[PDB]
């Protein structure tokens, strides 16, 4: 066919968002140079006693670099003190979610103007909850607080008289409330009694209080009375 | 049924790893006793310099060598005020550039061995030129960014450029481009025969598409393998 055609061709013929991110990135590294070096130096410097001042400075540190347009692309041309930074932020963002933890646990009412059967699931996922956060805790605070000592961080909060231990005392209130929700609904209906709901209902509480009491590391006395009022039953 | 049994059950209860914790303690041992090394190595990495790229390479070698002593790198370098950053930016840079040397080297010093038939030599230079091309492909894909760091930390930064290493992979595809179209016009004189003439169309079409492909990779032809080109083009 026509190979000569397809050659001449070739002969005569031998005679994006991308590139816009990288010059703003350089805009930030000479125009900025010397606002994140000054950063660098204050996180370097950083020492904190109270995890309160810590939050508050790493709320700034935030602030500081969001005037960064990509904070990771723009560091990765400074000696950034990565380890410490990082440190930081992950510190206050841990004791910030435990204390939302505790405060949620701690305030938890359970409303008497639900069903008993939406009650205490509600309580059951709360429960579920809790256990899985300090079961990840534990799971990660010594890593966490061998470096944080390093840092100057405070780790108070960590240990076991920390915001852990207020959780799992919450805990056994918990426990409480649902005990009691399981020994009111246990009296509210009928009749013949047990009855079929009437079992049941007694074994999700003994079984509730058990789970919690495995939990906590105990139970005080007036909910080790409660669960003695439940097998009584 | 027995549902009391059950109770009591749980009433006589309420009265009575070691892979990660071993892993914990021998990093707080390196952490305890190689804090001042590390410390160490992270002065001498800020304070570098280098101007060869060859010298870069001997830091990072040394410096791979001196890391191995920890337990684990991360866990232990998270402890420290390490400069990591730049440590990244040097190891990426000594890589980089050791492999590009490696293709480099490869694609020059390659051979058309003549006791391979056909196809199987072509498709030899074919594979090494797609090798070639992607790797070149996102090397100019990565290396504006690249250059931009490594400015900063005083890595160099010639070889990334055109007349850098770049240019000599660009111009031994040239040289690769040579060959192909020596394989298609011996192999065009050899076979069979007589008789002959099955793919006298087809295989000089590869080679003629061949070094077009080349040709607008590298950048152009010089004398000589434009010489082979019209050696092809007339037949």
Redesign the interface.
């Known amino acids: 066919?026509r190979?000569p055609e397809?050659?001449?061709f070739?002969?005569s013929?031998?005679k994006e968002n991308r590139?816009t991110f990288?010059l703003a990135?350089?805009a930030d590294?000479e125009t900025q140079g010397d606002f994140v070096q000054s950063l660098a130096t204050e996180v370097?410097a950083s020492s904190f006693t109270d995890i309160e001042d810590l939050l508050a400075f790493v709320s700034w540190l935030d602030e500081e670099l969001s005037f960064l347009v990509d904070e990771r692309?723009v560091?990765?041309?400074?000696?950034?003190?990565?380890?410490?930074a990082?440190?930081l932020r992950e510190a206050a963002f841990e004791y910030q979610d435990l204390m939302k933890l505790e405060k949620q646990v701690t305030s938890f009412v359970d409303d008497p103007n639900l069903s008993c059967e939406p009650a205490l699931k509600k309580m059951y996922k709360l429960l579920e909850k809790v256990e899985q956060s300090v079961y990840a805790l534990l799971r990660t605070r010594?890593?966490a607080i061998?470096?944080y000592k390093?840092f100057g961080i405070p780790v108070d909060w960590l240990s076991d008289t920390g915001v852990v231990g207020k959780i799992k005392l919450s805990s056994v209130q918990l426990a409480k409330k649902y005990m009691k929700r399981v020994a009111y609904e246990l009296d509210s209906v009928s009749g013949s009694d047990k009855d079929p709901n009437r079992?049941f209902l007694?074994?999700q509480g003994?079984?509730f209080?058990?789970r919690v009491?495995q939990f906590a590391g105990g139970?005080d006395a007036e909910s080790?009375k409660a669960?003695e009022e439940?097998?009584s039953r």
């Open positions: 066919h190979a397809l050659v001449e070739y002969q013929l031998m590139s990288l990135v350089k590294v370097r692309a560091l990765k041309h400074f000696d950034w003190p990565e380890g410490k990082d440190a010594d890593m061998s470096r390093e079992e007694l074994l003994v079984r209080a058990f009491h139970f080790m669960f439940l097998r």
